[PDB]
Automatic annotation (TrEMBL), chain B:
InterPro entries: AB_hydrolase_1, AB_hydrolase_fold. This is CFTR inhibitory factor. It comes from Pseudomonas aeruginosa (strain UCBPP-PA14). Residues 32-280 form the AB hydrolase-1 domain. Disulfide bonds join 270-278. Gene3D superfamilies: alpha/beta hydrolase (3.40.50.1820).
């Protein structure tokens, strides 16, 4: 899968970050790509996902908890999916993880096409 | 031969209504006709043919003007091209219904034969293309992921031979982009395979024939608006890729408007080119479906 | 040396802005109006409006970065990046008063961020013949019941691996004539000489690439504008669109009502996409009257 | 303005009318078909818009919906009226016209004076 997750940092509240998730071409093209997050001792939660491109187009979903602040987009040339996080709040602190599944609904349901990576740590300071 | 012929098969030709059609044929039993689509030839079936020919007689023609087949003498609309494919199949199965498997614009060029001669078609498999109808006018030109998968409809349909003029001399580059950008599993399109398909489509008449199918697409839509008043009654199966490049759920959803008896599958991790990108699961689904007969 | 004839009483000059040498043509006296051209063209598409507008205004028409005689941008081609260059250029000629802005086609893409982020700097706004980049552009169809759509080039130009440059190389003049005339209702105004001048300009390798880099940044611009459009435009605005084959029709005003509190729209009959050339007399009249109020 | 394709046809049969103009006139107007039966008012039949970046639109009168279709060939500057399932009440002279938009065609606006038309006679 050649999974690489990066972009996390220590950032003050109200600031922004962009996370990146890169995989092999086949893994990226075969899957709806999703961002998740998990704070230590809490549940992993769905953040955002973007479908593969079909002839009819595509679809993307951002969870209610981050709608209006986070956006997600694919760069198919780079096999990379990005999470743009604006107006960060301390409640956004977590390790953010990238995974894939057959469609967005499957990602929301907990399915994953590869074992979870190390993630990228996002710490939102005062 | 533009492509290597698998063991147990023969490359041959038959004239149908004044048009010399190339095909590859092998096997014994009831007839199955495999119809390729754009960017390819009969050769896209070369991995399904070995097992399929153990149970059926298999014929894989080149579409008129493509591969080693002569262009049509009537026209490139679906209703015109289907006449050639129907008479070809019936030359080999004149007294018994035959099976049909079609991919990409192979669907466009067979649907009129199927709906007009339903008693001739025992079982039907359609994969990775819309039947020409008004739903194609809803595909987006551009997407939030960039280049869409359908902008080529307009590029190829453009007047003044726009596409031939730009692509001539660059056939190998264009075909590699076109094929791989519609694929999830690009690795199967080796340098050698792309060389073979590029050399075939680079024949000036085949490059032009390729785009005449798209230039007849609106005529085919208008023909199918009348033909679709009769639903298909034979057992049908649709296959579509679930990865980048494929039709996804559109394939089965559209077919339900055409066919009374339809089952559909979306193959994960595959784009548009099912016979090459996921030969193993596609071959199993097709062989199992046709072997219910 | 000039790619296009400079009208009498106008100066062709250059100004470095953030390390990018920008070309512009300037003339007249009075408050400043900046005219921003679009794809396939240069400052010269304004050459019929400029002498009339210069009777009451100082008129400046830059070449977009990478096009005409302007160097490519050194940050990027997204709307928010390119808008910086045009804003700094305009403010160096009108540092203490607001200026007027007229933009056509991708000139809209490359000025909208400047306008919404510097509303006090913009007295009156005229936008013609292009969508502001937003998710509405994903609804345009790839193919239509009359054949080739007007928007398939979004995806052709945005395609990776330099697909557009590779296919258009050696066919620059052929392609640009078919692009311009396919988006026109009044094709007669595009003489052989005029098309020659435009083709020579965009055929420069960096200008051919720059042309398509605007489309390769289009989704970035859409995402940028999703944030910027939270602030509505408050200055008097006018939209123009062609009502003939090739134009935006009623879309232009309809979209602008979602962005602008004070907007009047006109749809020009008998005109496609290229309003300054196809419909010079009515377009010039509407622009001059709106700006002179 | 060239109007053609009319003729005598049995009920249940088909006909395709065509209307050709100059390029600029064709591209500058929504194109429409009308008809007038011997002792009736002229009647709107169908119209198709010009192509915009958003696409196009076409409409048909209730009296021909599902039987007649209209489409452009932009390479030939010709609009076609495909007439299926013809009925004796479709007998009329059919006229082509244009207007600055598809609604103006149905409002009374017209960019040219009426041509000769083309006669369609459907025999029972």
């Amino acid at each position: 899968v050649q999974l690489v997750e990066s972009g996390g940092g220590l950032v003050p509240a109200g600031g922004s970050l962009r996370l990146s998730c890169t995989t092999s071409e086949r893994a990226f093209r075969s899957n709806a790509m999703g961002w998740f997050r998990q704070a230590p001792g809490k549940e992993r939660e769905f953040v955002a996902a973007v479908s593969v491109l079909s002839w009819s187009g595509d679809s993307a979903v951002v969870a209610d908890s981050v709608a209006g602040r986070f956006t997600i987009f694919r760069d198919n040339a780079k096999n990379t999916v990005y999470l743009q996080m604006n107006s960060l709040k301390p409640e956004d602190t977590a390790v953010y993880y990238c995974n894939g599944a057959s469609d967005i609904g499957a990602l929301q349901s907990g399915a994953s096409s590869w074992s979870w990576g190390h993630g990228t740590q996002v710490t939102v300071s005062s | 031969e533009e492509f290597p012929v698998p063991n147990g098969f023969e490359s041959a030709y038959r004239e149908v209504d004044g048009v010399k059609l190339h095909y590859v044929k092998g096997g014994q039993g009831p007839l199955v006709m495999l119809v390729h689509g754009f960017g390819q030839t009969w050769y896209e079936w070369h991995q399904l043919m070995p097992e399929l020919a153990k149970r059926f007689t298999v014929i894989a023609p080149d579409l008129p003007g493509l591969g080693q087949s002569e262009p049509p003498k009537t026209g490139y609309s679906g209703e015109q091209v289907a006449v050639y494919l129907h008479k070809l199949a019936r030359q080999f199965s004149p007294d018994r219904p035959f099976d049909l498997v079609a991919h990409d614009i192979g669907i466009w060029n067979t649907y009129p034969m199927v709906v007009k001669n339903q008693a001739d078609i025992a079982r039907l498999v359609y994969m990775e293309a819309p039947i020409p109808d008004a739903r194609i006018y809803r595909f987006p030109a551009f997407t939030a992921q960039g280049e869409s998968l359908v902008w080529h409809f307009s590029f190829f349909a453009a007047d003044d031979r726009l596409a031939e003029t730009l692509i001539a001399g660059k056939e190998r580059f264009f075909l590699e982009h076109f094929i791989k950008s519609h694929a999830s599993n690009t690795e199967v399109f080796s340098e050698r395979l792309l060389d073979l398909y590029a050399r075939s489509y680079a024949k000036p008449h085949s490059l032009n024939a390729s785009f005449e199918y798209y230039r007849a697409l609106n005529e085919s839509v208008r023909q199918n608006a009348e033909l679709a008043k009769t639903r298909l009654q034979m057992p049908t199966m649709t296959l579509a890729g679930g990865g980048h490049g494929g039709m996804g759920t559109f394939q089965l959803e559209q077919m339900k408007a055409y066919a009374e008896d339809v089952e559909g599958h979306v193959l994960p991790g595959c784009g548009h080119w099912l016979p090459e990108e996921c030969a193993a699961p596609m071959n199993r689904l097709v062989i199992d479906f046709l072997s219910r007969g």
